[PDB]
C-alpha positions as a LaTeX table, in Angstrom:
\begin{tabular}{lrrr}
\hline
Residue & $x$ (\AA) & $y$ (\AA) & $z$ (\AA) \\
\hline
Unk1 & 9.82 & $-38.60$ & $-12.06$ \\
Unk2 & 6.32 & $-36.67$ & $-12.29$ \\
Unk3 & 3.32 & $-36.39$ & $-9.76$ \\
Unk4 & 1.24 & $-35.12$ & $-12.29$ \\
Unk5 & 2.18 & $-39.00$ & $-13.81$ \\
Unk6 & 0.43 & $-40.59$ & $-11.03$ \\
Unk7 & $-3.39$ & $-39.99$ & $-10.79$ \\
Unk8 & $-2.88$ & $-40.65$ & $-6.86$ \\
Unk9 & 0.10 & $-38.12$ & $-6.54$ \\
Unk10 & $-1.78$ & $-35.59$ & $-8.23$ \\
Unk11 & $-4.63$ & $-35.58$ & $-6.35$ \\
Unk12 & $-2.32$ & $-35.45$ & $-3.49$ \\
Unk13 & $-0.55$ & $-32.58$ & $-4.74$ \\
Unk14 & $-2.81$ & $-30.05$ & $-5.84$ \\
Unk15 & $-0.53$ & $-27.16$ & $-6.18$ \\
Unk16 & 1.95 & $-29.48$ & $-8.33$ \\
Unk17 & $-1.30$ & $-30.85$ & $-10.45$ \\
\hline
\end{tabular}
């Protein structure tokens, strides 16, 4: 349960990673 765990979701969600 992390964005920051998924390279994808991070780049997605820059304000979260």
């Amino acid at each position: 349960g992390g964005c920051c765990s998924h390279p994808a979701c991070a780049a997605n969600n820059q304000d979260y990673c």
